Amino acid sequence: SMTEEQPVASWALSFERLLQDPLGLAYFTEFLKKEFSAENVTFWKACERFQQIPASDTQQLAQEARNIYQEFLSSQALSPVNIDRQAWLGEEVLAEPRPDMFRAQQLQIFNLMKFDSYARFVKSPLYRECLLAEAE
């Protein structure tokens, strides 16, 4: 009935839950940083950060847009996220920043890590340490 939920176990039930829960995302990002492939989750975080901004404050949108752009979306990006660049917006997203722009690209990353880094995390430490210790 969705009235109650599992403890940290809920992560292994749904990636959404893992990705919506601060603890889940934290431990997940604790692994995903030391080897530096956090670009996906932090891009999703960036787009989430972008949609967090009220469409009313287009100025903040403009600021965040150029941030995410130069970091992940630039041709000289320090963290090049793998999305369809060929048909990507480009200068247009700087021209008109709106909190619905990177939506498809956001879900592109979401589904990218959904069956990969997620699938790995539930097998990796930190999860178990917060889930159980006696095993059975």
Swiss-Prot record:
Q: Where is the RGS domain?
A: 14-131
Compartments it resides in: Nucleus; Nucleus, PML body; Cytoplasm; Membrane
What domain of life does the native source organism fall in? Eukaryota
Post-translational modification as stated in the protein's UniProt record: Phosphorylated by PKC. Phosphorylation is increased in presence of forskolin and may enhance the GDI activity on G(i) alpha subunit GNAI1.
How does the annotation summarize its subunit structure?
Answer: Interacts with GNAO1, GNAI2 and GNAI3. Interacts with GNAI1. Interacts (via RGS and GoLoco domains) with GNAI1; the interaction occurs in the centrosomes. Interaction with GNAI1 or GNAI3 (via active GTP- or inactive GDP-bound forms) prevents association of RGS14 with centrosomes or nuclear localization. Interacts with RABGEF1; the interactions is GTP-dependent. Interacts with RAP2A; the interactions is GTP-dependent and does not alter its function on G(i) alpha subunits either as GAP or as GDI. Associates with microtubules. Found in a complex with at least BRAF, HRAS, MAP2K1, MAPK3 and RGS14.
State the protein's purpose. Answer: Regulates G protein-coupled receptor signaling cascades. Inhibits signal transduction by increasing the GTPase activity of G protein alpha subunits, thereby driving them into their inactive GDP-bound form. Besides, modulates signal transduction via G protein alpha subunits by functioning as a GDP-dissociation inhibitor (GDI). Has GDI activity on G(i) alpha subunits GNAI1 and GNAI3, but not on GNAI2 and G(o)-alpha subunit GNAO1. Has GAP activity on GNAI0, GNAI2 and GNAI3. May act as a scaffold integrating G protein and Ras/Raf MAPkinase signaling pathways.
Query: What does the record's free text say on domains?
Result: The RGS domain is necessary for GTPase-activating protein (GAP) activity for G subunits and localization to the nucleus and centrosomes. The GoLoco domain is necessary for GDP-dissociation inhibitor (GDI) activity, translocation out of the nucleus and interaction with G(i) alpha subunits GNAI1, GNAI2 and GNAI3.
Q: What protein name is recorded for this chain?
A: Regulator of G-protein signaling 14
- The organism encoding this protein is Homo sapiens (Human)
Parent-protein start and end of this portion: 56 to 189 of 566
